[PDB]
């Protein structure tokens, strides 16, 4: 046993991490970087122990030798008989969302439209949709498909960043961290909600959690699910209640990664930390809730019920699944 150094991406995650550190009595301390890739590097250098990552980032981390430790597990879809920590993870639904009022828009008329992405390299926001588009257009010029986009992590002066807004002060336009107004699941959905973009590439859960009163945030408090539609691959449009039959793919759950030589220890500490601050945790809500951050999904997605043990001590390729790994590989050929 020892202290686990978490890596926070950006100043807001840093703040939440500091609160967690304080409440844990320094059982967890914080390192902070401006981007997920920088955090991946801190971990590789041994300057940080771990962080929770989207599948696309797990691919980057895995290539560099980091391993998955525990996976996010949400309010179980499959009516189970096992505890959350032991429950297998199902995966989330990557979807393409548009405004119902934007009537002519389908998967087949996306070219030259405006797009909102969680961030370059992320599963639902980038790898799945751009991999599909590259494949279908038979062209690697995915940076010329949409007329403008907000794809945090791309070149700030490029069309891929044209729609990004930066922070309060209008600084950090397109940075791949929560300071960018349209970053992540909620940022990309907001980009759609405010009609900055024509389509948003997020997950099923994002639409639900930010509509019909689920979010009191000012830009989301008035959003109605009926005002949105999902784009299915067969060219049809469906209500957001049909994500099961109208998604782009099933994505592997975000998961915690660490150096192989620190994995066992990181796992031990996290399992204990969630007993304290997770859902129903001894000290949540009274003191600190590890899986809450007012829909900002800081450190962990807010809809996380618990971090679950993995089956079969999977390598990053096994955790992500061969198909997805090859999909990423294929897309990477373009850059």
């Amino acid at each position: 046993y020892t202290r686990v150094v978490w890596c926070a991406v950006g100043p807001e995650e840093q703040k939440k991490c500091q609160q967690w550190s304080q409440q844990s009595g320094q059982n967890v301390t914080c390192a902070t970087a401006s981007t997920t890739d920088d955090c991946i590097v801190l971990v590789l250098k041994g300057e940080a122990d771990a962080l929770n990552l989207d599948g696309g980032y797990i691919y980057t981390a895995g290539k560099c030798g980091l391993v998955p430790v525990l996976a996010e597990n949400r309010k179980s879809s499959k009516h189970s008989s096992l505890d959350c920590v032991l429950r297998p993870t199902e995966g989330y639904l990557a979807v393409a969302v548009v405004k119902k009022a934007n009537e002519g828009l389908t998967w087949n008329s996306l070219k030259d439209k405006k797009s909102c992405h969680t961030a370059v390299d992320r599963t639902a926001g980038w790898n799945i949709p751009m991999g599909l588009i590259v494949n279908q257009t038979g062209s690697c010029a995915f940076d010329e498909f949409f007329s403008q986009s907000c794809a945090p992590g791309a070149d700030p002066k490029s069309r891929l960043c044209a729609l990004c807004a930066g922070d309060d002060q209008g600084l950090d336009k397109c940075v791949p961290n929560s300071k960018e107004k349209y970053y992540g699941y909620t940022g990309a959905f907001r980009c759609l909600a405010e009609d900055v973009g024509d389509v948003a590439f997020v997950k099923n859960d994002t639409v639900w959690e930010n509509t019909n009163g689920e979010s009191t945030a000012d830009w989301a408090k008035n959003l109605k699910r009926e005002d949105f539609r999902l784009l299915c691959l067969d060219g049809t449009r469906k209500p957001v209640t049909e994500a099961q039959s109208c998604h782009l793919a099933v994505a592997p759950n975000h998961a915690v990664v660490s150096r192989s030589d620190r994995a066992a220890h990181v796992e031990q500490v996290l399992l204990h930390q969630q007993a304290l601050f997770g859902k129903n945790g001894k000290n949540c809500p009274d003191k600190f809730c590890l899986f809450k951050s007012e829909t900002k999904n800081l450190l962990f997605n807010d809809n996380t019920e618990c971090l679950a043990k993995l089956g079969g001590r999977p390598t990053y390729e096994e955790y992500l699944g061969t198909e997805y790994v090859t999909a990423i590989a294929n897309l990477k050929k373009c850059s």
């Binding site: 590097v41 980057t60 030798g65 050929k333």
Partner: peptide, 6 residues
């Protein structure tokens, strides 16, 4: 397209 991007 196969080693660590760092």
């Amino acid at each position: 397209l196969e080693a660590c991007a760092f």
